[PDB]
């Protein structure tokens, strides 16, 4: 029951967000089902957690068109592309949870 | 100018720490000039920062044997590997800053 993920499909990417329920070992890496999305399109991952966990998560989609990880203050940051942006460009995205 | 790195070698990896002195902005990826390493070995990174700059720098060594990145919490978490640790796994590296 320890993470919940929120996957959410746009015309030029998939948002990819993560939730930690339990408190987590990097064990959980080794368990973890990924969710599986359009890899014709690129991801956005998103969520509160150590940094091992987005950096697992963004290896795990490496082979889409791009990945890019999301910062509060500034949208989402690419970190990694095949195709159609470039590593640092940002994608103009923001998101709320329930106040 | 923005930032440092400094690069310690060890028999199984060579560590990577970074440091940013200014602030930065996400153009800063398509400019950074990463250290080159024993690519037969695995790599551990340590350093504060944005998840953003993790996330590349741990991308950047993805040829390496594995990737692993540093938790004062717990020691060098593996994230992804081609060959020597499996993701997860938890290198016990103790690393220290020191002020200066």
């Given at each position: 029951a320890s993470m919940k993920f929120a996957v959410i499909d746009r015309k030029n990417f998939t948002l990819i967000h993560f939730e930690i329920e339990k408190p987590i070992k990097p064990e959980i890496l080794k368990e973890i089902e990924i969710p599986s999305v359009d890899t014709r399109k690129g991801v956005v991952i998103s969520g509160r957690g150590?940094?091992?966990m987005h950096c697992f998560l963004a290896?795990?989609?490496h082979h889409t068109?791009?990945?890019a990880v999301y910062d509060p203050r500034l949208g989402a940051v690419v970190?990694?592309?095949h195709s159609e942006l470039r590593e640092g460009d940002v994608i103009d995205v923001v998101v709320e949870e329930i106040l």
């Open positions: 150590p940094m091992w290896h795990k989609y068109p791009f990945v970190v990694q592309s």
